[PDB]
RNA sequence: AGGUAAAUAAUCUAAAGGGAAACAGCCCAGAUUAAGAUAUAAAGUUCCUAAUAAAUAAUAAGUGAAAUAAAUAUUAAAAU
RNA sequence: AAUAUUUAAAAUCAAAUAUAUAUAUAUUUGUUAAUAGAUAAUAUACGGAUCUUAAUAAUAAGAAUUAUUUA
RNA sequence: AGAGUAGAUAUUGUAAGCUAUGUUUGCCACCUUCGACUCAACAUUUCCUCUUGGUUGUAAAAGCUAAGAAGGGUU
RNA sequence: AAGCUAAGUUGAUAAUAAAUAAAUAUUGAAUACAUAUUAAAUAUGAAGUUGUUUUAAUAAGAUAAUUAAUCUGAUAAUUUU
């Protein structure tokens, strides 16, 4: 009845011993990490306008981050995925735009075809929100601090003056044909090569930018927007993550 | 501490110790007599 | 000293064994030379080869260089020699007044058994 | 050797046992080694406490006169001989602790230099010239008590642990030479400098 | 004449277990022993032009022997190319990061011949800090060895 | 001084081969053409890399492991 | 145990070889170690890996360092 | 040696001794551009910042001297 | 006016934690004393180290769909985030 198999004595008679835990494991990394105790929500940077404090009279530039159909699609767990995170989805998209596979995924998770999806990593299993629920601006409290991730404005192929604040050469006094140049780019033969990471002209902007400890000036569920003190990376209609500030409480 | 190659005990109250692969001379009476071998 | 003559200051075990073997070979050669002379002298007197080989009283060599080589005070055998004189020459300009024999040029051919009494 | 040869006296209330460990560990030096197998215990009135010890060492319990001896398999082995004098001394200290108890008096010296039991004995608050509050938690086994504010007493079964704790307490402010001023553990002295 | 026949078994990649808890060799000597196996020098059919070396599964690698004070002294180096980026890690640190198996692998890599097959040979080495491993089922075994092993242990292994 | 000036010997010069990591001059040894069984030289024999097993001591410093760094200091060890 | 030198086979003793030979004479050989001192600029740099062993327990490892040797 | 109110070794340290460095001025002869601007990379023999030993010459405060330390900074 | 900009605006100098350096201790022999250990045990300790934080790269893993009247991409057009 049983299948034919041979087993080595060396592997059978080996005394059982558990492996020690390693730093470059997922679970150790998770333990190390500095993470927020609560989920976040995806937003769109609609624009920017003044916020007048009515008690003091102080004016503050505030960016208006709109919150539309923001929904916990699913979430990830340490036993399956190696970490705790809430996959949030923002907005509504047409059928036409969304891939068949993506549409099927959304149907399975029981949400509308979504405009932008993103994870929000958390410390514990307690931080996970039940899936399918709708996240509104009232999630955040007025006066609380939040970290803000988004892709910055694209600046194109930039020079070393704009990239790195290089002083450049003089305007007059003989200076020929190199007024905005980086000057020397190395050393005569000891290196015999431009060493890695030498600040040179290149593409700038259109990279991710976390902005830490920004104050939530105002929250209102009526207009579907979170007011946030100061600037946020990227153009108008750019997607903006928002989670509680790890540094500030 | 007088960090030096030569490390002799000065007074009777000085005592030599061998720690961390270095000869230390501590002293119970005079604190100036503290020495270390390199 | 920009050119690198990477010669170690001391010999390996295998080098030392080879040196010892070489020393032993020169002693053997000397022994053979004396033995053959003795045999020849026995033959001249009127013995057979076998009889000469058997002989109790072996004849010592009359020529000077051979006689000197036979003497251990002048030319010692490998078994007689000190550990130091097998592997270290006398070099007056070196510190310790000593230098590895392997540093001598053509040390594999050139013989040097006897060092000075206190150097 | 001269220490380890000295026999240990025991009173009927105290029992010095010995037995093998559950999982013996081996200390590996450069050339020599040292396998910790046995585990001596000193049970008594005030408490009980143990010493993990090498295989080469073993006791010799005598019924007559309450003596016990300690010996190693090779006294001419240097490491073993060194261990022998240590272990005997350790078990003597344990005996002393379980029967009598080890003590460590700290006297505070200075204007407004004093100790206080803050967490019902579980945290010795120490005020010794600092804006920030200073102190540390008492370990298990250690019992602290304060007859005066400026004179604290630490008490325990382990001579090692109590005196370590005392040293830690002192470390906040050791005695200064100019004014005999700080925290003095037991009979501690300091040569006071001339004022000038 | 000697070469003519069925050569498939000669060039067969066997799988060699080594329970490091049982093995009494030090790290470097063990690594050297492994290297030969990985190359295929042990087998007489070997030729330098052909990779014909076996798999080596190392297990219970946490109990590997290292002499002296090498565990807290011996430094493993690394360098990207950009100056001021020399990464020097002590053996214990490396172990903490990855394991004792990583350490063994490095030794084995250094032992191996420096050419296009080296990487392949290194890959064939399968090291494990503890006991449990997927290749348990594929170590070379014989029917005559089966009496030594108890009945239910074999079944448990098969299940695993 | 990898300096300079000559004395003696060798090699290079004009010398390929093995060793010395790599190497004009050091250690072996001189390519007429092959063959590859046997003796080998200097140098080697854990792996990279052709080839190894022992004995008695010492070191614990990775000292050292083919390019030996000094006076002096400390700690031992023998002998008187 | 303490004090103070020396680190030696010249003397001395022991061992071995050669001449008359159970002895004498002559010759040859045998007398410390570790650490610190220690040190610059592209990058660790014994050529590299790596090398100092461990009972339970292996048909099995235990310098791959230094010194004197053997097969 | 000698200064240091006294005490060579807190701090100082003649002349002579033993080394390291390859930062100066030379020597050799294998080998036939100073400064400014710009951007700097590396070292540590550390000037500042952090930790610490000594300081009859650390009462305090400023110091002096020494050990660790090249993360950040150094008109 | 938009845009772009700094003279402008907003934020950050990335914790907690772990093991350490010099240095400071505990018990304690070897060595009747002494000795923080170049012994066994037990503790403190730095703008440094490990990390943490941030960016870029990579893609283990995960959800879903699976020869298609509208599967997934590309070529094409109108464009700019
Ligand atoms: Mg300008
Ligand atoms: Mg112009
Ligand atoms: Mg010349
Ligand atoms: Mg010519
Ligand atoms: Mg040639
Ligand atoms: Mg010629
Ligand atoms: Mg010829
Ligand atoms: Mg070394
Ligand atoms: Mg070297
Ligand atoms: Mg003599
Ligand atoms: Mg270097
Ligand atoms: Mg080599
Ligand atoms: Mg004077
Ligand atoms: Mg002078
Ligand atoms: Mg002060
Ligand atoms: Mg320094
Ligand atoms: Mg850091
Ligand atoms: Mg600002
Ligand atoms: Mg004592
Ligand atoms: Mg003490
Ligand atoms: Mg810190
Ligand atoms: Zn003193």
XYZ file of N, CA and C in Angstrom, chain A residues 112-198:
261
model
N -15.626 49.298 -5.594
C -15.678 49.834 -6.954
C -14.279 49.875 -7.582
N -14.197 49.846 -8.932
C -12.901 50.000 -9.596
C -12.241 51.316 -9.201
N -11.018 51.212 -8.696
C -10.411 52.248 -7.877
C -9.408 53.058 -8.685
N -9.219 54.306 -8.271
C -8.387 55.264 -9.000
C -6.912 55.171 -8.600
N -6.655 54.808 -7.344
C -5.296 54.647 -6.829
C -5.316 53.743 -5.601
N -4.411 52.767 -5.559
C -4.322 51.822 -4.443
C -2.956 52.003 -3.783
N -2.914 51.851 -2.460
C -1.667 51.977 -1.702
C -1.769 51.328 -0.325
N -0.645 50.794 0.148
C -0.566 50.176 1.474
C -0.298 51.221 2.548
N -0.680 50.884 3.777
C -0.406 51.708 4.949
C 0.057 50.810 6.084
N 1.374 50.727 6.258
C 1.972 49.775 7.186
C 1.758 50.236 8.626
N 1.490 49.272 9.506
C 1.191 49.535 10.917
C 2.017 48.630 11.828
N 2.016 48.964 13.115
C 2.805 48.255 14.119
C 2.228 46.878 14.446
N 0.939 46.851 14.781
C 0.281 45.670 15.345
C -0.931 45.236 14.524
N -1.504 44.098 14.913
C -2.774 43.615 14.357
C -3.969 44.470 14.814
N -3.816 45.170 15.940
C -4.851 46.073 16.467
C -5.087 47.287 15.563
N -4.019 47.774 14.930
C -4.092 48.919 14.018
C -4.885 48.700 12.739
N -5.020 47.440 12.322
C -5.786 47.080 11.121
C -7.260 47.461 11.274
N -7.802 48.099 10.238
C -9.215 48.468 10.184
C -9.938 47.309 9.492
N -11.203 47.021 9.879
C -11.956 46.003 9.134
C -12.128 46.362 7.652
N -11.964 45.379 6.742
C -11.960 45.691 5.317
C -13.362 45.951 4.774
N -13.428 46.733 3.700
C -14.693 47.177 3.116
C -15.194 48.524 3.619
N -14.653 49.008 4.740
C -15.151 50.233 5.373
C -14.704 51.487 4.629
N -15.459 52.564 4.832
C -15.214 53.848 4.187
C -14.489 54.783 5.156
N -13.328 55.285 4.738
C -12.543 56.233 5.536
C -12.896 57.657 5.119
N -13.277 58.476 6.099
C -13.698 59.860 5.866
C -12.677 60.788 6.539
N -12.674 62.096 6.189
C -11.740 63.055 6.814
C -11.768 63.103 8.349
N -12.933 62.831 8.943
C -13.090 62.727 10.404
C -12.226 61.648 11.079
N -11.643 60.745 10.285
C -10.559 59.857 10.732
C -9.538 60.623 11.575
N -9.014 61.712 11.018
C -8.025 62.550 11.700
C -8.717 63.579 12.587
N -8.051 63.948 13.680
C -8.503 65.028 14.559
C -7.851 66.341 14.144
N -8.553 67.445 14.390
C -8.026 68.780 14.102
C -6.944 69.105 15.128
N -5.786 69.554 14.645
C -4.632 69.834 15.500
C -3.626 68.700 15.614
N -3.985 67.497 15.148
C -3.064 66.355 15.180
C -2.000 66.500 14.097
N -0.885 65.804 14.298
C 0.227 65.799 13.351
C 0.189 64.553 12.478
N 0.580 64.716 11.213
C 0.606 63.619 10.244
C 1.840 63.689 9.343
N 2.347 62.518 8.959
C 3.349 62.401 7.899
C 2.621 62.376 6.561
N 3.265 62.915 5.527
C 2.641 63.083 4.211
C 3.595 62.643 3.097
N 3.264 61.545 2.409
C 4.044 61.083 1.252
C 3.350 61.395 -0.069
N 4.149 61.815 -1.049
C 3.686 62.063 -2.416
C 4.873 62.268 -3.356
N 4.621 62.112 -4.653
C 5.648 62.296 -5.679
C 5.750 63.783 -6.004
N 6.966 64.325 -5.937
C 7.202 65.759 -6.137
C 7.012 66.201 -7.589
N 6.925 67.518 -7.782
C 6.880 68.128 -9.115
C 8.112 67.743 -9.924
N 7.898 67.343 -11.174
C 8.989 67.044 -12.091
C 9.642 68.329 -12.566
N 10.968 68.392 -12.457
C 11.752 69.565 -12.867
C 12.562 69.357 -14.153
N 12.561 68.134 -14.686
C 13.251 67.829 -15.936
C 14.749 67.710 -15.746
N 15.470 67.643 -16.863
C 16.927 67.537 -16.841
C 17.535 68.854 -16.364
N 17.956 68.883 -15.102
C 18.457 70.100 -14.463
C 19.975 70.125 -14.354
N 20.499 71.335 -14.173
C 21.926 71.566 -13.996
C 22.323 71.472 -12.539
N 23.631 71.485 -12.303
C 24.185 71.384 -10.945
C 23.922 72.609 -10.058
N 23.607 73.751 -10.670
C 23.231 74.954 -9.924
C 21.853 74.777 -9.288
N 20.886 74.311 -10.079
C 19.525 74.074 -9.588
C 19.420 72.799 -8.748
N 20.070 71.724 -9.200
C 20.112 70.457 -8.451
C 20.709 70.628 -7.065
N 21.968 71.055 -7.040
C 22.803 70.975 -5.845
C 23.229 72.322 -5.256
N 22.704 73.425 -5.791
C 23.051 74.756 -5.292
C 24.520 75.097 -5.459
N 25.112 74.636 -6.562
C 26.505 74.939 -6.886
C 26.614 76.425 -7.197
N 27.712 77.031 -6.760
C 27.905 78.475 -6.892
C 28.131 78.897 -8.343
N 28.704 78.001 -9.147
C 29.048 78.309 -10.532
C 30.233 79.254 -10.598
N 30.653 79.577 -11.815
C 31.794 80.466 -12.020
C 31.330 81.917 -12.071
N 32.290 82.837 -12.133
C 31.993 84.272 -12.098
C 31.317 84.737 -13.386
N 30.625 85.869 -13.296
C 29.918 86.453 -14.438
C 30.876 87.193 -15.363
N 31.828 87.909 -14.766
C 32.822 88.688 -15.500
C 34.231 88.237 -15.093
N 35.229 89.106 -15.283
C 36.635 88.819 -14.954
C 37.187 87.617 -15.727
N 37.010 87.646 -17.045
C 37.612 86.652 -17.932
C 36.851 85.358 -18.169
N 35.886 85.036 -17.301
C 35.174 83.751 -17.343
C 34.618 83.453 -18.733
N 35.047 82.329 -19.306
C 34.685 81.960 -20.670
C 33.856 80.679 -20.723
N 32.603 80.821 -21.159
C 31.812 79.710 -21.712
C 31.411 78.633 -20.673
N 31.543 78.924 -19.373
C 31.261 77.933 -18.312
C 30.640 78.566 -17.059
N 29.732 79.519 -17.245
C 29.230 80.336 -16.128
C 28.389 79.547 -15.113
N 27.697 78.507 -15.585
C 26.818 77.677 -14.750
C 27.352 76.260 -14.499
N 28.623 76.022 -14.815
C 29.194 74.672 -14.755
C 29.676 74.294 -13.358
N 29.848 72.990 -13.152
C 30.253 72.440 -11.861
C 31.731 72.537 -11.521
N 32.550 72.990 -12.470
C 33.980 73.165 -12.243
C 34.694 71.832 -12.353
N 35.497 71.505 -11.342
C 36.198 70.225 -11.297
C 35.233 69.100 -10.945
N 35.425 67.946 -11.580
C 34.639 66.744 -11.298
C 35.483 65.589 -10.741
N 36.748 65.853 -10.416
C 37.597 64.828 -9.819
C 39.017 65.260 -9.506
N 39.927 64.286 -9.552
C 41.305 64.431 -9.078
C 42.268 63.732 -10.043
N 43.454 64.304 -10.248
C 44.381 63.845 -11.300
C 45.057 62.499 -10.996
N 44.397 61.431 -11.403
C 44.963 60.091 -11.427
C 45.063 59.223 -10.196
N 44.926 59.772 -8.989
C 44.974 58.886 -7.837
C 43.712 58.056 -7.960
N 42.587 58.742 -8.154
C 41.305 58.093 -8.409
C 41.319 57.559 -9.819
N 41.842 58.381 -10.720
C 41.882 58.049 -12.141
C 40.504 57.769 -12.707
N 39.482 58.324 -12.060
C 38.085 58.040 -12.380
C 37.183 58.965 -11.569
N 36.044 59.351 -12.141
C 35.033 60.096 -11.389
C 34.381 59.118 -10.424
N 34.481 59.416 -9.132
C 34.038 58.495 -8.091
C 32.508 58.500 -8.029
N 31.886 57.341 -7.720
C 30.424 57.237 -7.643
C 29.731 58.306 -6.797
N 28.543 58.700 -7.241
C 27.764 59.749 -6.607
C 28.343 61.145 -6.715
N 29.136 61.404 -7.759
C 29.661 62.748 -7.992
C 28.518 63.596 -8.532
